[PDB]
């Protein structure tokens, strides 16, 4: 877990879907996760992407992953493994 590029999409997904499941994680966990996910994404939005998603923005796990991956690309930062 050093960068977004240590990750396979499938791998990142599972991470996101976990964040997004509230009986998956004690609250200190989620905390660690959420902090990882902002570090990984370098998205200015951070976890507003998770809980204050903008109007008509797919907020399922894949929907988030997707967004990260489309922003990250028009910024052209590094992407996922494979």
């Amino acid at each position: 877990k050093h960068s977004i590029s240590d990750y396979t999409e499938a791998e990142f997904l599972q991470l996101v879907a976990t964040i997004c499941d509230a009986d998956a994680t004690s609250e200190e966990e989620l905390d660690k996760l959420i902090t990882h996910f902002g570090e990984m994404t370098e998205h200015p939005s951070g976890s507003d992407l998770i809980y204050y998603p903008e109007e008509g923005d797919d907020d399922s796990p894949s929907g988030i992953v997707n967004t990260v991956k489309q922003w990250r690309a028009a910024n052209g930062k590094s992407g996922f493994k494979q």
Binding site: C20, A22, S45, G46, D48, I50, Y51, Y52
Partner: protein, 120 residues
């Protein structure tokens, strides 16, 4: 074995927009209605059931995102925006102005909860 009493207040459709200032946002009347038929075991049991009921009210649930309703369904408080975050305090807080009088309980952001107990 804990009981809750109180009326709460009628609220709008931007319930927590005020949560930043003064003593925050009130317990909504319709939520209070439900919580007073219940029994609790701690202010912690009270908190979890408070969030629960919020998740179920048509007119409040509508003001939270899916992932937020998902927390509140199992009794965790909604995450704030990142800009109202402080330290490891990332979700909305209950503040008690003194067995649980909901007319002296409210909902605050972390940074406002901070200021309140450091006298600003």
């Amino acid at each position: 074995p804990g009981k809750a009493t109180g009326k709460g207040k009628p609220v709008n459709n931007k319930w927590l927009n005020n949560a930043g200032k003064d003593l925050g946002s009130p317990v909504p009347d319709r939520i209070a209605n439900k919580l007073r038929d219940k029994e609790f075991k701690s202010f912690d049991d009270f908190r979890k059931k408070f969030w629960e009921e919020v998740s179920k009210d048509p007119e409040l649930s509508k003001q939270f995102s899916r992932n937020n309703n998902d927390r509140m369904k199992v009794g965790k408080a909604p995450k704030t925006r990142t800009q109202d975050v402080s330290g490891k305090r990332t979700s909305f807080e209950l503040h008690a102005e003194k067995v649980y009088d909901m007319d002296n309980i409210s909902v605050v952001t972390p940074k406002r909860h901070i200021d309140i107990h450091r006298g600003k």
